[PDB]
Enzyme design. Structure first.
Site, PDB file in Angstrom:
ATOM      1  N   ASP A  24       0.955   5.333   1.313  1.00  0.00           N
ATOM      2  CA  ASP A  24       0.377   6.258   2.271  1.00  0.00           C
ATOM      3  C   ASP A  24       0.893   7.670   2.009  1.00  0.00           C
ATOM      4  O   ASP A  24       2.102   7.872   1.846  1.00  0.00           O
ATOM      5  CB  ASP A  24       0.725   5.844   3.711  1.00  0.00           C
ATOM      6  N   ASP A  54      -3.772   5.175   0.829  1.00  0.00           N
ATOM      7  CA  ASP A  54      -4.367   5.883   1.947  1.00  0.00           C
ATOM      8  C   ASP A  54      -3.983   7.346   1.846  1.00  0.00           C
ATOM      9  O   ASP A  54      -2.802   7.656   1.663  1.00  0.00           O
ATOM     10  CB  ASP A  54      -3.849   5.361   3.286  1.00  0.00           C
ATOM     11  N   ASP A  57       0.850  -1.163   0.000  1.00  0.00           N
ATOM     12  CA  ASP A  57       0.000   0.000   0.000  1.00  0.00           C
ATOM     13  C   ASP A  57       0.893   1.223   0.000  1.00  0.00           C
ATOM     14  O   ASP A  57       2.117   1.142   0.133  1.00  0.00           O
ATOM     15  CB  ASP A  57      -0.990  -0.001   1.163  1.00  0.00           C
TER      16      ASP A  57
END
Ligand SMILES: [Br-]
Ligand SMILES: [Br-]
Ligand SMILES: [Cl-]
Ligand SMILES: [Cl-]
Ligand SMILES: [K+]
Length: 325
Positions: A195, A249, A193
């Site tokens: 961020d 995110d 992921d």
DNA sequence: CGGCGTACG
DNA sequence: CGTA
DNA sequence: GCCG
């Protein structure tokens, strides 16, 4: 060797990889059974090995290390003597572990949901696809995109993505900035992921920013899934001649809180839990990604940098790449 | 024995 | 319940 | 499961 992970440098790559991986299997399995205490001990023991300066070759080298007791020491002993630990292998090949691991990989699915599906007899992703009545819209997106989301993204992908996010952010609020956090800030070359932390140098100008950013990214066609100051999304990332889904995110913080938000979102997850535990239990101060509270004075510490926060907690400064607990 | 991050969506 |  |  200090007892909390926030008291010791922990690099991304280290000298006890096989041993730490085995303990983390047991930690994961503890979490699948709801034993959070055992999960924490096995995670902490694994992280101690990540922080050592050289390989463990003999059981005597565990003496005096925090978080190594009878169970974790026996795991290491069996790996050192036989190359394999029977308990770890029994976990690896168990239907319970394999299915809980598969299901909790899905975006929108936690241990409780996975456990419920397991008890209902479900075992595979196709089992879930055949019962879409059982799925939230979030889980439907996580299931559709699971294959792409299982493949790591590279730092070069992250950089191209950051430029796209920065353009949307600059239209949403000129002067607002985008900072890469999470595992890539800790030095990862690949990850699952991405961020980003968004702020603006004028306190208060960031109010209402995240909806304006998301609307613009959605208008650019970049958002495959999204549901405020935190957004957990699935983004469309360019690939040679096509594209792939990536977890991204986005977080907004006021600039007064930026050191706390950066320290928070940089992780690692265990580093954060250890740091907040240390703050409360050793220093009597309550830490989150907004601030650091003294409950006796009823005051907040006004940090200007991550270095400020470490100093205030009486910790030696750790750069992000030494926070890979 | 009690404790085990602390939030937001 | 989920997300970090 | 381990610490304190
Ligand atoms: Br900072
Ligand atoms: Br938080
Ligand atoms: Cl437990
Ligand atoms: Cl504790
Ligand atoms: K999940």
């Amino acid at each position: 060797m200090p007892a909390y992970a926030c008291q010791r440098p922990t690099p991304l790559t280290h000298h006890n990889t096989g041993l730490s991986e085995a303990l983390e299997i047991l930690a994961e399995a503890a979490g699948f059974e709801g034993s959070e205490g055992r999960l924490l001990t096995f995670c902490r023991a694994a992280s101690v090995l990540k922080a050592l300066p050289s390989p463990v070759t003999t059981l005597s080298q565990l003496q005096g290390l925090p978080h190594f007791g009878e169970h974790s020491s026996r795991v290491v002993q069996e790996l050192l003597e036989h190359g394999v630990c029977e308990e770890v292998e029994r976990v690896r090949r168990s239907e319970r572990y394999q299915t809980m691991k598969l299901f909790t990989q899905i975006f929108g699915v936690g241990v409780k949901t996975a456990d419920r599906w397991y008890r209902e007899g479900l075992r595979t992703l196709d089992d879930l696809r055949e019962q879409p009545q059982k799925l939230t819209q979030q889980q439907k997106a996580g299931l559709q995109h699971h294959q792409d989301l299982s493949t790591p993204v590279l730092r070069s992908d992250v950089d191209a993505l950051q430029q796209v996010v920065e353009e949307a952010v600059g239209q949403a609020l000129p002067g607002a900035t985008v900072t890469l956090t999470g595992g890539f800030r800790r030095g990862k070359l690949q990850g699952h992921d991405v961020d980003f932390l968004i702020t603006h140098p004028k306190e208060g100008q960031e109010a209402g920013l995240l909806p304006r950013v998301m609307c613009r990214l959605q208008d650019q066609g970049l958002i495959l899934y999204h549901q405020f100051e935190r957004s957990f999304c699935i983004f469309r990332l360019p690939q040679p001649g096509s594209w792939k889904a990536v977890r991204v995110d986005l977080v907004v913080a006021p600039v007064s809180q930026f050191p706390f938000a950066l320290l928070g979102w940089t992780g690692s997850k265990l580093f954060q839990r250890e740091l907040r535990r240390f703050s409360r239990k050793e220093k009597g101060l309550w830490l989150n990604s907004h601030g650091l509270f003294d409950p006796e004075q009823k005051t907040f510490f006004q940090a200007a940098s991550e270095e400020d926060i470490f100093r205030h907690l009486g910790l030696e400064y750790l750069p992000p790449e030494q926070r890979n607990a």
